[PDB]
Design a protein around this ligand. Structure first.
Ligand SMILES: COC(=O)N[C@H](C(=O)N[C@@H](Cc1ccccc1)[C@@H](O)CN(Cc1ccc(-c2ccccn2)cc1)NC(=O)[C@@H](NC(=O)OC)C(C)(C)C)C(C)(C)C
Ligand SMILES: CNC[C@H](O)c1ccc(O)c(O)c1
Lengths: 210, 280, 128, 58, 340
């Protein structure tokens, strides 16, 4: 009778309680640019998912990705695959249902870029304008590395990505660029520091504080 | 009817805002979040205040004397202290929840749950009752002064004249410890918000000086004068006039209405508030 | 349907001028952001330029900025984008394509075919 | 190019198949639709408010 | 080459022929045919029950045959099966893949379906066990995300995918019997005609195609929408169907005239359409929008039958019971609301 239905509903809700606990504990992440990956860092659940198994038509399955903590956007710093990443990032930032998702931007293949920029192989100035009118910013940390020419182009791609980030997304959007291509195992750590700030900034706005 | 309008207004605003908050959270499941359960505790405490102590305090002020009996006076005083300490400790709990959510986001998400929120509100109400109810019916508050002696025996005297030990211990454990805890947690939250000035764009920087000051401003401007008087009275009674003591008490009652106006400014609240105030 | 017939093109010597006009039918022109996509032989589809509904928000691919300009006539339901100082590297099959959703500031247009809101394009060759 | 021409040929065959189809007058179809709607209007428990006794959701 | 050129020319000639044939069959319009009928007027529907218990946004829903039980699919990874009359849970199914874009309820009331950004249609049987939920069969033959699935009777299920192709699946054999190819964009929604013989399918190419289950070849193509079609539902008679779209429009398409009969749009609506469904008599066409609400449209007068408020997040799924007693809508606020 109704007693059995009530007991079954109570048991289902009891299971859903633990399901709520686990779901709130786990933070989901999207890998876009290059199916499931769960990794533990400082004892907090993290869930990576790459959806490269679908077609290039992206406008209608990405509508399904809006509860994630961040969208991790990886680009190749080397057809013009750069503006294709730029235009994709524009779509992510300005989308109605992706308007509350931060992006952990990763500029991958920097070493491939670095080996590329040591001679006039494919000049960015002749490929992207306003390069000869752009210099490395004063508030920068070039660090000991290659010829200071590469870090000028290194920071130019990050700057161009950021102009899209700062042009919209009043408070629900924040971009977190990073310079990383070599496997060193601290990249996942860089995500933890980025995801911490995303939730922290989410709570600051939610309490009408930031 | 001077006090019949000046004091009838505050109790009405106390009840009008507070029940409007309580019905709003329960009606729409969007506001039934983790943090707003503490908002339910604050609203319930201010509502029982505005229904049990504020209206009777108004009569005790206008009529000039208590007219409900010694047992009713004792119960009214117990409800007064219970509601006041419950409201203050609920503010402290809300501040602690904000601190834990800001400075430890993942730990806050994976640590505090609905069961633990219920435990927290139950514990805070139990502590408020133990601090309020227990040492009153036991007459720990009764002073041994000649002036104090007359008021206890009189059936129309409901004046809170107390010994120094109670006037110090209750004051600290009711206001000063929560005030210090809230000040420290909100200072840490402000420093973290200021650390989040790394937003690269080359009242945004002063926004943290409006939200956090207003939480402390409403609390400090209204309840600090009362417990400052309750402390200066224990050492020497004649400095603070009896008129001022009642005057500062009503400032503390104002937070029962100033609290829904401060903690319910969220756009989710206003969307539910407009649909609740339609009255079609 | 959503037919988008493109015109212009052909063979033009480098350094000349040539104009593309794409006719729109089946949808309200004023409600849609439109953009041009080109595809050089062998290479994939590359976004050229986009223009907002009112013709205010206009952006170009870096390789074509300062040479091509894009303008739309909402009354005539046609989209124009001009050649100036052509180079041999711009030989491609230029397409006129529409943003999938009306009154939206973001697009997901460039796709390896299978995109209905794009015409059949006009072949442009710069060889002289 | 072979895939493109094959797809175009398939589209042409599909369009040719869709070309030769018997079509009824739009007025007749409208009449049939409105006739069905009017005939089954009594049984629809959304056009007219259901009595509270018969409604199982109240 | 020139071969593709004259092939495209022939295709254009055939398109012109189809257009002028459609125009020749346009002697009247639904507006003036319906004009004499009495307006339905204002219809007020109130939330009977709110179904809470899901974690993430609810993406799809489907009523049972008996108008008692509905299944809800959410991106949390759950397939909670509800009981509308007494607002409890019947079953709660944890999904192998966390993202589900579609769920179906078998007409026999014995099987349930799901699927999403995993390219597999998982079938869960609710009867044969001693009390449990287990994956009876997993259908993996799609190269794109599953967007909609519907059981035929008990063993055949048609799935619409983002792979630009629909497919008929034999559950017992776990094999793709027939495939439905001819679309251009991702197929989102398919609706089965009553007394199942043929089904429609609206995709991102702004075109809805009518497919024959046995033949496997589409009969007619209806291209009247400006943008992507996000939903489609069959009119109860079976000679018509209504299609939602991102063009802020719902259009009723007749099967026997191959034409759009009426356009349901208002100048105050900019948002797209998520789900559409007819009423029992077909008088009211219910449509869930991205304007946070679910507008109710009169299916003959093209007038606002009544504004239906509700969820604080976008509505994605909208369904009507077979007996037509109530209308259940699910949104991205993890809430299902029942209205009458
Ligand atoms: C559902 O109802 C509400 O949320 N009510 C809101 C409300 O009335 N909130 C008050 C809170 C308040 C009022 C009076 C005393 C204490 C607290 C706000 O009115 C407060 N504040 C006026 C105010 C200014 C200073 C102080 C103050 C300063 C020093 C010490 C103590 N208080 C108190 C209130 N108002 C402002 O100028 C802005 N908010 C704000 O100040 O908070 C960031 C608005 C505009 C966004 C409302 C509004 C109707 C304004 C939306
Ligand atoms: C007479 N009114 C009591 C006042 O509200 C009060 C509140 C808290 C205390 O700790 C206290 O000693 C007195």
């Amino acid at each position: 009778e109704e007693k059995a239905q009530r007991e079954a509903n109570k048991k289902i809700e009891k299971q859903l309680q633990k399901d709520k606990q686990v779901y709130r504990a786990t933070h989901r992440l999207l890998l876009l640019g290059a199916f499931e990956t769960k990794f533990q860092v400082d004892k907090v659940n993290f869930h990576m998912f790459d959806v490269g198994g679908q077609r290039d038509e992206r406008r209608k399955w990405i509508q399904c990705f809006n509860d994630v903590t961040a969208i991790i956007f990886v680009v190749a710093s080397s057809t013009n695959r750069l503006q294709e990443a730029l235009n994709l990032f524009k779509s992510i930032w300005n989308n109605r249902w992706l308007r509350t998702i931060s992006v952990i931007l990763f500029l991958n293949k920097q070493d491939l870029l670095a080996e590329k920029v040591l001679a006039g192989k494919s000049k960015i100035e002749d490929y992207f304008p306003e390069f000869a009118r752009y210099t490395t910013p004063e508030d920068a940390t070039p660090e000991p590395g290659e010829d200071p020419r590469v870090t000028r182009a290194k920071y130019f791609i990050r700057d161009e990505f950021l102009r899209i980030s700062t042009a919209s997304g009043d408070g629900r959007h924040y971009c977190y660029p990073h310079f990383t291509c070599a496997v060193d195992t601290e990249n996942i750590r860089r995500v933890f520091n980025d995801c911490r700030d995303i939730i922290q900034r989410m709570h600051l706005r939610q309490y009408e504080l930031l | 009817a001077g006090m019949g309008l000046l004091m009838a207004l505050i109790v009405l605003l106390i009840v009008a805002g507070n029940v409007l908050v309580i019905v709003a959270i329960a009606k729409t499941p969007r506001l039934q979040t983790l943090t707003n359960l503490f908002i339910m505790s604050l609203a319930s405490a201010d509502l029982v205040m505005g229904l049990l102590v504020v209206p009777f305090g108004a009569t005790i002020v206008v009529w000039g004397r208590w007219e409900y009996g010694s047992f009713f006076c004792e119960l009214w005083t117990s409800v007064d202290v219970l509601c006041v300490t419950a409201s203050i400790e609920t503010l402290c709990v809300i501040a602690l929840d904000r601190y834990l959510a800001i400075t430890s986001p993942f730990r806050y998400q994976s640590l505090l749950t609905r069961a633990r929120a219920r435990g927290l509100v139950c514990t805070v109400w139990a502590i408020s009752a133990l601090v309020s109810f227990l040492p009153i019916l036991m007459h720990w508050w009764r002073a041994e002064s000649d002036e104090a002696r007359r008021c206890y025996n009189d059936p129309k005297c409901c004046d809170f004249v107390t010994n120094r030990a109670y006037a110090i211990a209750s004051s600290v454990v009711s206001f000063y410890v929560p005030l210090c805890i809230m000040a420290f947690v909100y200072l840490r939250v402000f420093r973290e918000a200021q650390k989040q000035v790394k937003k690269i764009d080359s009242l945004r920087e002063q926004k943290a000086l409006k939200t956090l000051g207003i939480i402390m401003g409403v609390f400090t401007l209204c309840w600090l004068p009362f417990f400052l008087a309750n402390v200066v009275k224990a050492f020497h009674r004649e400095l603070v006039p009896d008129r001022l003591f009642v005057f500062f008490n009503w400032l503390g009652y104002a937070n029962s209405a100033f609290n829904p106006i401060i903690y319910c400014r969220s756009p989710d609240f206003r969307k539910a508030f407009q649909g609740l105030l339609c009255c079609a | 349907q959503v037919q988008l017939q493109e015109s212009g093109g052909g063979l033009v010597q480098p350094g000349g001028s040539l104009r593309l006009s794409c006719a729109a039918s089946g949808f309200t022109f004023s409600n849609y952001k439109m953009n041009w996509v080109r595809q050089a032989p062998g290479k994939g589809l590359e976004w050229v330029s986009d223009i907002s509904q009112s013709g205010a928000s206009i952006s170009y691919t870096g390789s074509v900025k300062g040479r091509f300009t894009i303008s739309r006539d909402n009354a005539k339901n046609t989209l124009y984008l001009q050649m100036n100082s052509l180079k041999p590297e711009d030989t491609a099959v230029y397409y006129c394509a529409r943003c999938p959703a009306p009154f939206t500031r973001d697009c997901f247009d460039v796709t390896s075919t299978t995109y209905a809101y794009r015409g059949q394009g006009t072949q442009v060759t710069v060889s002289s | 190019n072979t895939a493109s021409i094959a797809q175009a040929r398939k589209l042409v065959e599909q369009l040719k198949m869709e070309a030769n189809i018997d079509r009824i007058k739009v007025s007749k179809a409208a009449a049939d639709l409105m006739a069905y709607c009017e005939a089954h209007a009594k049984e629809d428990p959304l056009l007219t408010p259901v009595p509270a006794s018969e409604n199982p959701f109240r | 080459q020139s071969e593709l050129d004259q092939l495209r020319q022939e295709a254009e000639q055939l398109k012109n022929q189809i257009r002028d044939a459609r125009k020749a069959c346009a002697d009247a319009t639904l507006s003036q045919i319906t004009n004499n009928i009495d307006p339905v007027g204002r219809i007020q529907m109130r939330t009977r029950r709110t179904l809470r218990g899901h974690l993430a946004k609810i993406y799809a829903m489907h009523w049972g045959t008996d108008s008692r039980l509905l299944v809800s699919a959410s991106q949390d990874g759950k397939l909670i099966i509800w009981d509308s009359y007494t607002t409890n849970k019947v079953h709660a199914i944890p999904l192998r893949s966390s993202w589900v874009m579609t769920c179906a309820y078998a007409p026999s009331g014995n099987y349930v379906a799901c699927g999403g950004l995993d390219n597999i249609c998982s079938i869960y049987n609710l009867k044969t066990r001693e009390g449990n939920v287990r994956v009876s069969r997993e259908l993996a033959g799609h190269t794109g995300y599953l967007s909609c699935c519907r059981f035929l009777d008990d063993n055949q299920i048609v799935t619409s995918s983002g792979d630009t192709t629909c497919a008929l699946w034999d559950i017992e054999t776990g094999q793709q019997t027939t495939t439905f190819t001819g679309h251009t964009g991702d197929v989102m929604s398919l609706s089965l005609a009553p007394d199942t013989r043929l089904f429609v399918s609206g995709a991102c190419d702004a075109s809805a195609k009518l497919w024959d289950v046995r033949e496997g070849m589409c009969r007619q193509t209806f291209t009247g929408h400006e943008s992507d079609i996000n939903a489609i539902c069959f009119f109860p008679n079976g000679n018509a169907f209504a299609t939602g779209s991102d063009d802020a429009t719902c259009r009723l398409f007749d099967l026997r005239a191959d034409q759009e009969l009426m356009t349901y749009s208002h100048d105050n609506i900019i948002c797209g359409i998520t789900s559409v469904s007819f009423s029992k008599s077909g008088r009211l066409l219910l449509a869930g929008y991205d304007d946070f609400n679910c507008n109710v449209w009169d299916a003959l007068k093209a007038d606002r039958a009544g504004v239906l408020a509700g969820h604080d997040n976008r509505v994605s799924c909208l369904g009507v019971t077979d007996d037509g007693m109530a209308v259940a809508t699910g949104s991205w606020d993890s809430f299902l609301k029942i209205w009458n």
